[PDB]
Amino acid sequence: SNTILGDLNDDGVVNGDDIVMMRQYLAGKTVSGIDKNALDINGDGAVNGRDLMELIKKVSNN
Amino acid sequence: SVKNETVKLSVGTVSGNPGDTVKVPVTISQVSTPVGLICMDISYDASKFTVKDVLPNTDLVKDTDNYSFIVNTSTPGKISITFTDPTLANYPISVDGILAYLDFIINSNATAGDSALTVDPATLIVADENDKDIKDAASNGKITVTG
Numbered sequence: 001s002n003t004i005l006g007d008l009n010d011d012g013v014v015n016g017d018d019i020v021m022m023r024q025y026l027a028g029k030t031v032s033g034i035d036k037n038a039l040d041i042n043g044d045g046a047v048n049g050r051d052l053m054e055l056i057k058k059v060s061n062n
Numbered sequence: 063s064v065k066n067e068t069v070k071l072s073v074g075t076v077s078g079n080p081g082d083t084v085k086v087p088v089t090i091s092q093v094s095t096p097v098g099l100i101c102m103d104i105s106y107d108a109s110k111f112t113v114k115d116v117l118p119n120t121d122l123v124k125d126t127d128n129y130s131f132i133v134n135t136s137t138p139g140k141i142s143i144t145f146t147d148p149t150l151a152n153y154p155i156s157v158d159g160i161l162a163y164l165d166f167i168i169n170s171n172a173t174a175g176d177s178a179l180t181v182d183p184a185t186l187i188v189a190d191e192n193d194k195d196i197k198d199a200a201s202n203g204k205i206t207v208t209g
């Protein structure tokens with residue numbers, strides 16, 4: 001029931017805390033409290049640096 | 063992308079004896095549009111080599127204090143390198159040079175001969191500061207084990 005694009009921690013907002021999770025996840029770290037369902041931001045089937053790129057864009061455009 | 067250039071990500075070559083630690087570079091060339099994003103995977107023979115370090119060239123990869131250069135080795139025999147400009151403007155890659163350095167440990171019981179370092183061409187991504195595709199091209203490297 002997380003309907004906010006890029007809200008990896010499912011706290012209602014999209015900010016640098018979600019960027020931290022994406023970065024830590026891309027490095028292969030275990031991210032506690034992460035919503036794995038929110039990682040594929042551009043809906044292309046994979047979770048990679050282009051989802052981080054999109055996430056950094058969304059924050060700057062807020 | 064307006065230039066319609068093809069950026070090439072190349073992996074270098076190195077020779078070493080069994081048990082040696084060897085350094086091989088990863089280079090980017092034919093850069094024209096400022097690059098804000100790079101995703102690339104490098105495949106290696108896990109039975110022969112163990113990843114020791116994957117470090118950026120800070121004279122080219124800036125803002126590494128804010129995690130612009132991410133490394134993932136969670137998959138056997140694969141190194142995933144992600145470069146992103148955290149500012150989307152201030153720290154792009156705009157010249158040809160070395161992107162990173164790969165340090166491998168050669169298994170002491172490794173056999174002599176070449177072992178390719180392959181850049182996955184289907185996962186290679188290169189984009190500008192607004193995440194727009196830049197045409198990419200992969201060039202493989204290798205490690206020559208001497209005996």
Ligand SMILES: [Ca+2]
Pocket residue numbers: 006007008009010011012013014015017018
């Ligand atoms: Ca959030």
Ligand SMILES: [Ca+2]
Pocket residue numbers: 039040041042043044045046047048050051
């Ligand atoms: Ca994606």
